[PDB]
Amino acid sequence: SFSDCEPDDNHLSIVTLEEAPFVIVEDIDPLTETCVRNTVPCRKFVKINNSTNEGMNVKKCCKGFCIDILKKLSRTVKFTYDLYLVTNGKHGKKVNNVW
Amino acid sequence: NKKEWNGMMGELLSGQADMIVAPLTINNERAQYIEFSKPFKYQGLTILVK
Amino acid sequence: NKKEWNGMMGELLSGQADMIVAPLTINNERAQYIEFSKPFKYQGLTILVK
Amino acid sequence: LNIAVLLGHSHDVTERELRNLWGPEQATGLPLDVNVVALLMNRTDPKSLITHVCDLMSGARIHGLVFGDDTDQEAVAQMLDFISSQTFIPILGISGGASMIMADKDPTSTFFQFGASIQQQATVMLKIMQDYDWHVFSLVTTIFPGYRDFISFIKTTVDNSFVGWDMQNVITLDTSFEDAKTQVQLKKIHSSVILLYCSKDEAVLILSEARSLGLTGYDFFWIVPSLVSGNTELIPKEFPSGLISVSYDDWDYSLEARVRDGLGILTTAASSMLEKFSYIPEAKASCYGQPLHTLHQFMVNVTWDGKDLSFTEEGYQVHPRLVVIVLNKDREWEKVGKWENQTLSLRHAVWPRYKSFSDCEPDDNHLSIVTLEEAPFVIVEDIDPLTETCVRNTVPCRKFVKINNSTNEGMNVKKCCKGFCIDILKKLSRTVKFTYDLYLVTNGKHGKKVNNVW
Amino acid sequence: GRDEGCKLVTIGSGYIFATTGYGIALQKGSPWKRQIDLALLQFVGDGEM
Amino acid sequence: ASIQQQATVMLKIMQDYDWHVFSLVTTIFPGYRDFISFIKTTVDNSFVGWDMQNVITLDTSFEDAKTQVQLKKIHSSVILLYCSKDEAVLILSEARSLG
Amino acid sequence: KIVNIGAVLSTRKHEQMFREAVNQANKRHGSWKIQLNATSVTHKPNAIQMALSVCEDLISSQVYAILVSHPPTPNDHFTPTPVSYTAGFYRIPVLGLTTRMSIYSDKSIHLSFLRTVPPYSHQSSVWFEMMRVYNWNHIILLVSDDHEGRAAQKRLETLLEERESKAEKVLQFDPGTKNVTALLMEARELEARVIILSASEDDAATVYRAAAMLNMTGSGYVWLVGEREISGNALRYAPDGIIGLQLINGKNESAHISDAVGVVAQAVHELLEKENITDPPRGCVGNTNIWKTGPLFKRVLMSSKYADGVTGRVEFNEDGDRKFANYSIMNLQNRKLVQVGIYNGTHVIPNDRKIIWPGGETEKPRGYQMSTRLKIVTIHQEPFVYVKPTMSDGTCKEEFTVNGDPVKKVICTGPNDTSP
Amino acid sequence: EKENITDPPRGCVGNTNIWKTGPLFKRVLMSSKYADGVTGRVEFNEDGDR
Amino acid sequence: YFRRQVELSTMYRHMEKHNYESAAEAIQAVRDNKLHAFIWDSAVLEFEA
Numbered sequence A: 001s002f003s004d005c006e007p008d009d010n011h012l013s014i015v016t017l018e019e020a021p022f023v024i025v026e027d028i029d030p031l032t033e034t035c036v037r038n039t040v041p042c043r044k045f046v047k048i049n050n051s052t053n054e055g056m057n058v059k060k061c062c063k064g065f066c067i068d069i070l071k072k073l074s075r076t077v078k079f080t081y082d083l084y085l086v087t088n089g090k091h092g093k094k095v096n097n098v099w
Numbered sequence B, C: 001n002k003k004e005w006n007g008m009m010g011e012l013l014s015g016q017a018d019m020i021v022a023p024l025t026i027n028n029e030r031a032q033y034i035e036f037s038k039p040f041k042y043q044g045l046t047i048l049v050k
Numbered sequence D: 001l002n003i004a005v006l007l008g009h010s011h012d013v014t015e016r017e018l019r020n021l022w023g024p025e026q027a028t029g030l031p032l033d034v035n036v037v038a039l040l041m042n043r044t045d046p047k048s049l050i051t052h053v054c055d056l057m058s059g060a061r062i063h064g065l066v067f068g069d070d071t072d073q074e075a076v077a078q079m080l081d082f083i084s085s086q087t088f089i090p091i092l093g094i095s096g097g098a099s100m101i102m103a104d105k106d107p108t109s110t111f112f113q114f115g116a117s118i119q120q121q122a123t124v125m126l127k128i129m130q131d132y133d134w135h136v137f138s139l140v141t142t143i144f145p146g147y148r149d150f151i152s153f154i155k156t157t158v159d160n161s162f163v164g165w166d167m168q169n170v171i172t173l174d175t176s177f178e179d180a181k182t183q184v185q186l187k188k189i190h191s192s193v194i195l196l197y198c199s200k201d202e203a204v205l206i207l208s209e210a211r212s213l214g215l216t217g218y219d220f221f222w223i224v225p226s227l228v229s230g231n232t233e234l235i236p237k238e239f240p241s242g243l244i245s246v247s248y249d250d251w252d253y254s255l256e257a258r259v260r261d262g263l264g265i266l267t268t269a270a271s272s273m274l275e276k277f278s279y280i281p282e283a284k285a286s287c288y289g290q291p292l293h294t295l296h297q298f299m300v301n302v303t304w305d306g307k308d309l310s311f312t313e314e315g316y317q318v319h320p321r322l323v324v325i326v327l328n329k330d331r332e333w334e335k336v337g338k339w340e341n342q343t344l345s346l347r348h349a350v351w352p353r354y355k356s357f358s359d360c361e362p363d364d365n366h367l368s369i370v371t372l373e374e375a376p377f378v379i380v381e382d383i384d385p386l387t388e389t390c391v392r393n394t395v396p397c398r399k400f401v402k403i404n405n406s407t408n409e410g411m412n413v414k415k416c417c418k419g420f421c422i423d424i425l426k427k428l429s430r431t432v433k434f435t436y437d438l439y440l441v442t443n444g445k446h447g448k449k450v451n452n453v454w
Numbered sequence E: 001g002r003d004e005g006c007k008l009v010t011i012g013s014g015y016i017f018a019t020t021g022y023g024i025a026l027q028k029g030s031p032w033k034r035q036i037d038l039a040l041l042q043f044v045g046d047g048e049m
Numbered sequence F: 001a002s003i004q005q006q007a008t009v010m011l012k013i014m015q016d017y018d019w020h021v022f023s024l025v026t027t028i029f030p031g032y033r034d035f036i037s038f039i040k041t042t043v044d045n046s047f048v049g050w051d052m053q054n055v056i057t058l059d060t061s062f063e064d065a066k067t068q069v070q071l072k073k074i075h076s077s078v079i080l081l082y083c084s085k086d087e088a089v090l091i092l093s094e095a096r097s098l099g
Numbered sequence G: 001k002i003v004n005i006g007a008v009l010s011t012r013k014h015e016q017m018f019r020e021a022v023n024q025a026n027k028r029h030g031s032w033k034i035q036l037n038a039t040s041v042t043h044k045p046n047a048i049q050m051a052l053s054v055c056e057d058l059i060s061s062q063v064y065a066i067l068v069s070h071p072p073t074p075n076d077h078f079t080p081t082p083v084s085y086t087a088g089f090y091r092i093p094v095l096g097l098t099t100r101m102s103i104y105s106d107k108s109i110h111l112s113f114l115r116t117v118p119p120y121s122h123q124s125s126v127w128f129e130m131m132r133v134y135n136w137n138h139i140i141l142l143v144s145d146d147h148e149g150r151a152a153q154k155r156l157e158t159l160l161e162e163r164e165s166k167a168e169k170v171l172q173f174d175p176g177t178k179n180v181t182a183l184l185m186e187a188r189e190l191e192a193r194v195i196i197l198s199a200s201e202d203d204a205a206t207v208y209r210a211a212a213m214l215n216m217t218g219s220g221y222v223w224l225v226g227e228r229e230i231s232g233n234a235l236r237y238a239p240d241g242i243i244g245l246q247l248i249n250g251k252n253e254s255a256h257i258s259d260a261v262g263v264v265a266q267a268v269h270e271l272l273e274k275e276n277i278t279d280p281p282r283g284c285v286g287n288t289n290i291w292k293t294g295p296l297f298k299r300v301l302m303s304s305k306y307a308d309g310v311t312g313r314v315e316f317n318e319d320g321d322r323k324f325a326n327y328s329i330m331n332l333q334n335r336k337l338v339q340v341g342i343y344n345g346t347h348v349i350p351n352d353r354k355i356i357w358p359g360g361e362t363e364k365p366r367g368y369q370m371s372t373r374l375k376i377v378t379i380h381q382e383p384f385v386y387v388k389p390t391m392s393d394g395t396c397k398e399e400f401t402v403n404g405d406p407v408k409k410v411i412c413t414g415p416n417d418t419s420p
Numbered sequence H: 001e002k003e004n005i006t007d008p009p010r011g012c013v014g015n016t017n018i019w020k021t022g023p024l025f026k027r028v029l030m031s032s033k034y035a036d037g038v039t040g041r042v043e044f045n046e047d048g049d050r
Numbered sequence I: 001y002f003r004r005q006v007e008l009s010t011m012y013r014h015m016e017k018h019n020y021e022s023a024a025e026a027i028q029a030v031r032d033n034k035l036h037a038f039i040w041d042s043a044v045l046e047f048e049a
């Protein structure tokens, strides 16, 4: 809400999983604190330890195939997006009505 | 000055048929006019020579 | 926060050199500043292995 | 039959040859009761025209009107079409506002205009653009009438582009110039041909706004039809020298031949309906105190005086005479091109530019380019006669082909070119952003000095 | 295609296998779906894929 | 701090948040030469690949004829404004009116 | 200091209400120094002398507003066309209040004809909203006309673009014929039972007789007609259970007269707020050039927002009609028009009356059949579709594959090899 | 000849704000056309000199 | 699909001269050395091989 009536529906929450030909998640440049521009930023919910549940969001770089697909869709469909990772695990498995 | 459809699409869109059971060429042309489903065949093009 | 050339360009632009007689890789960027001669040699790139 | 003739003040045409347009005309006169009533009028008010209609309809049962206009009021044609929906008399609108393109004719009227539709004139203008190979263009349309089917025909033509026409999107103006929102729509144009669709004074204001904003360069072309232009005799201010217009009011093919051919068509229709039906005079007696055998659905096939003067299904001529004009540096609308029977021919295939648009516009954008036939570099091929279009990854070029071995005359042949140097020139025109002037060499090979002669 | 030594070439090319594809799972009721499908068929339909 | 150090802080924010597509709107406000010059010597000397739209200049009180078009020639994300406070009120009111 | 106002009206009571509303218009609207006068024309059958009296009373009066106010003219053509065609000589807007046709809706055919009465395309949008209520998609459209039928089809395609979907079947024909029963039988074999009709009285009576003959008055038949279909013998031929629409306060004359007076008055005052106002000159004396502030007057009139009105919030759209007009959903029950709902704005308000369908219950009949039967079209595909001629008559040899699986053929029907 | 006649207030006593029509005065002065002058023609660039 | 693309113009002009009705016509033509190449789906051509 910058004003009273402003439609903001172009925001797309996007989560992915690390795959070596598709989703290459690597470190940031330790000298400039900058992802190289063909990569995109991501945050990873890294917890403190196994006892607590709250944690920080480590910012990392992302290249690969699906990153290129997402960039070309953002060129074509012209949307906005937020990239992050899930820590529950792999793609999907319903553990007794719990995915 | 209109390009209309003939053949299987021209008979389906006219309501003469209900389903084109055929090796459908799923492309960007026919996607703008009808809806699609998931493909059964995963096949590429190549060149026949002698 | 300023980038500068050096080396052979640093020796040439200071007035301490008149002509760099050397088969230099003539690129676009160094030709944007100073004039270059006609390239006498046509030579590419290669990889040395054992 | 009894046909009335009334005009305004077009082309300073005297009324004397109108009264003398009966003697040698209709030499093979099979209908006997064919006479003319040729008059004039000081003004162009429609109420006096209705008064003359009610005077001449009861005036010994006049069964015809041939009317021509000198002004630019298309509503008079609407009033005449309404009268033709009441009197049910075939009335020929010749020129001026009486023959201008209205929106949608009705089957309940027998009024006939002369010429072609606005879609056929758009087809002729796109044929001109195909012959000149100018593919990146724009389209500025106002709320001027007849816009719906015209824009729809343009959209269906661009969607059916074998040429691959690059049409910039439709610049729409709901009202006149706001100088806030319409200026932004005018400054979105970076194409070559700008197509304007409005009235005459609105075109003057839009060209004045474009000249005040520098949008009237020779890169920015301007092509308007006859209905946007208006009177051929009146040339108002803020016109670029080279203003392409398409009309039909030729000074060589004047009003007298038009009205003589129209009377020939009317007497041909009377003779053709007389040999089929007997009681030809069927008109309303008087206008005060208020559909069997007509000529509306009867004269589709007609060819008078050799030339095809047949009627379309939408109330126009099948093959009219089209005149394509430009503006010179002497403020004169000079005739350039005419139309063939089926296709379109052009005299000035070589295109002059008429550099004097403003105080200073240099021609530094264009570069004279000549080359030689080289199989990996300059691939020269014929133009396709089925399309009359070099495909968009090829570029056209002209060649001075001499006919005989001992003559000094030679024609210009346009041929397609693809290859390596074509791609180099296209990428240079992408990056350096210049324009090219491509043609072929006629003297021979690359170069050799033959006694101080290269 | 990145194997050191290149001593592993799999049997066949999916002839005796599942031979499925990869897609984008959208939520049930998203208006983005037709636009994403047209964008993917444009990305395949020009050689860019 | 100087205006160059504060521009360094703002570009450090933009580097930490990776908003590469930006613009630059500078009025006749004082210090405009060194400010635009430092933006040039920071973006052009950067290894990041910042998408730099050209500089939009506003001379005087707006005619709302050409300045409207120059504001509508901005399709980037970050809009850097360089003016006084009341001029910032006027330019933000014009941008709210122009959307 | 006087300005005449042209009206096509003959009743002295409505002219008295008109002059009282003019006196109200000159009362509180500022210190502007204009005076106003009325000039109205009466009933004449001869439309040529109608246009003659109109142009004689428009040229010799210097009017600003032209209000046609006779819908029930005894001429069956119903043409207020020559008034607007005469006023288009100076691009003068005629603000008529009579017709509701799409042939009058054109800004290109009629040059500057404004109105506050909407055509049947707004009824099509109300029907689209009703389909959004009842959650239906597939229709069967039958339009008798072709002039307004193309505009109705374009408005339907606009509503489909709002839906981002497509309709099922549209049809147009020539009025006067009687064997359009075959098109109704072709529409019977579809997968929907929603019928939308755009017709006059005669075509509606013809298709109601066809519905009585083809058993189209059974269960599930969703009938949806408008204003020209609920009059004459078609009202007698209408089945009990048909749904009609009627906009409120249109047939009551004086209230929309007063609303038009308020609109015209506030438009004239906001036009005369500014300077350099020209006047339409006398066309009979030396004045053939166009009125230069025509598009200026159109910019003032087409962008005039109003908060006053007896009917409600009146506002001109992009085509010069009434934004969000009120409507009444009527139903036919034992040859009686029973009111079963209303529609303002964007929202449907059904009352506590029984919405009775021509079939069974008061709930909506879903005419989307289960579609047990399908039609498979194909080509002779060389890896896929193997076509073999039959042995004796329509029979297939029960052959086996290499694994004992019997080749389950099908009796298909194929054309020739080359079609021309 | 034009409107919006603004006056700079007396900043010594009870006037602290800025003169808001500064760029208005710049639009008036910097866009002036000259065809007469004793020393000659003066003309304004973006800097406003002779 | 080839008429849309940016460089397939000469191949489009070559293929438009001798378009065939059925694929069996193309098989018989390339069998009788009337054709010399044909664009077709891969697994169908493997089955025909």
Ligand SMILES: *[C@@H]1O[C@H](CO)[C@@H](O[C@@H]2O[C@H](CO)[C@@H](O)[C@H](O)[C@H]2NC(C)=O)[C@H](O)[C@H]1NC(C)=O
Pocket: G344, G345, G346, G347
């Ligand atoms: C009758 O007319 C009004 C006109 O506005 C409409 O009411 C709108 O609908 C929502 C529904 O919740 C109401 O909250 C608002 O009062 C109105 N909103 C807007 C933007 O106008 C509606 O069509 C009808 N009345 C009702 C049911 O609210």
Ligand SMILES: *[C@@H]1O[C@H](CO)[C@@H](O)[C@H](O)[C@H]1NC(C)=O
Pocket: A047, A048, A049, A050
């Ligand atoms: C808690 O977390 C850290 C990483 O954040 C890691 O060393 C290990 O998981 C735990 N050990 C401690 C106490 O640091």
Ligand SMILES: *[C@@H]1O[C@H](CO)[C@@H](O)[C@H](O)[C@H]1NC(C)=O
Pocket: A048, A049, A050
């Ligand atoms: C949490 O548990 C894992 C698995 O036992 C192990 O690495 C370690 O005990 C803890 N540290 C983290 C955060 O992995």
Ligand SMILES: *[C@@H]1O[C@H](CO)[C@@H](O)[C@H](O)[C@H]1NC(C)=O
Pocket: D009, D042, D043
């Ligand atoms: C009307 O007639 C007069 C001569 O009486 C002439 O001067 C004038 O030009 C005419 N009007 C028009 C429109 O030509």
Ligand SMILES: *[C@@H]1O[C@H](CO)[C@@H](O)[C@H](O)[C@H]1NC(C)=O
Pocket: D300, D301
């Ligand atoms: C004109 O003649 C041709 C050929 O006889 C025929 O089509 C028809 O009679 C006329 N044209 C029309 C209306 O098709």
Ligand SMILES: *[C@@H]1O[C@H](CO)[C@@H](O)[C@H](O)[C@H]1NC(C)=O
Pocket: D306, D307, D308, D340, D341, D342
């Ligand atoms: C065009 O038509 C006219 C009239 O029928 C004819 O005389 C002329 O030869 C034709 N020209 C050509 C060659 O198209």
Ligand SMILES: *[C@@H]1O[C@H](CO)[C@@H](O)[C@H](O)[C@H]1NC(C)=O
Pocket: D402, D403, D404, D405, D406
């Ligand atoms: C010119 O000369 C050549 C060679 O004699 C001859 O074949 C040709 O017909 C002549 N005509 C031309 C092309 O000028």
Ligand SMILES: *[C@@H]1O[C@H](CO)[C@@H](O)[C@H](O)[C@H]1NC(C)=O
Pocket: D403, D404
């Ligand atoms: C000139 O060229 C034309 C066209 O080829 C040919 O008909 C003519 O005979 C030539 N002239 C001579 C006499 O060589």
Ligand SMILES: *[C@@H]1O[C@H](CO)[C@@H](O)[C@H](O)[C@H]1NC(C)=O
Pocket: G002, G036, G037, G038, G039
């Ligand atoms: C109003 O118009 C009528 C008809 O033209 C006229 O008789 C009457 O005098 C006019 N009244 C005034 C003074 O406005």
Ligand SMILES: *[C@@H]1O[C@H](CO)[C@@H](O)[C@H](O)[C@H]1NC(C)=O
Pocket: G178, G179, G181, G182
């Ligand atoms: C309409 O025409 C068909 C033609 O077969 C005929 O069978 C049918 O009886 C006709 N119906 C009417 C209403 O006359």
Ligand SMILES: *[C@@H]1O[C@H](CO)[C@@H](O)[C@H](O)[C@H]1NC(C)=O
Pocket: G215, G216, G217, G218, G219
């Ligand atoms: C058709 O008529 C029969 C008469 O018994 C009736 O039962 C049925 O509801 C009607 N509806 C259909 C199926 O058309």
Ligand SMILES: *[C@@H]1O[C@H](CO)[C@@H](O)[C@H](O)[C@H]1NC(C)=O
Pocket: G252, G253, G254, G255
């Ligand atoms: C029209 O509406 C007004 C105001 O509601 C009312 O007084 C009048 O009686 C109505 N007239 C008719 C004919 O219903």
Ligand SMILES: *[C@@H]1O[C@H](CO)[C@@H](O)[C@H](O)[C@H]1NC(C)=O
Pocket: G274, G275, G276, G296
């Ligand atoms: C009145 O004058 C203005 C300029 O002040 C100009 O737009 C036009 O000439 C006229 N129209 C209106 C009402 O703005």
Ligand SMILES: *[C@@H]1O[C@H](CO)[C@@H](O)[C@H](O)[C@H]1NC(C)=O
Pocket: G311, G312, G313, G314, G323, G324, G325, G326, G344, G345
């Ligand atoms: C419909 O009638 C209601 C009565 O309250 C009114 O508020 C509303 O504005 C009307 N709708 C229109 C715009 O005709």
Ligand SMILES: *[C@@H]1O[C@H](CO)[C@@H](O)[C@H](O)[C@H]1NC(C)=O
Pocket: G415, G416, G417, G418
């Ligand atoms: C279609 O055409 C042929 C023509 O002889 C006919 O004999 C046969 O019944 C059909 N055959 C094919 C190829 O379908």
Ligand SMILES: *[C@@H]1O[C@H](CO)[C@@H](O)[C@H](O)[C@H]1NC(C)=O
Pocket: H002, H003, H004
């Ligand atoms: C005065 O300022 C206002 C607001 O900028 C502007 O609309 C108006 O035209 C100005 N008048 C003049 C001519 O000074």
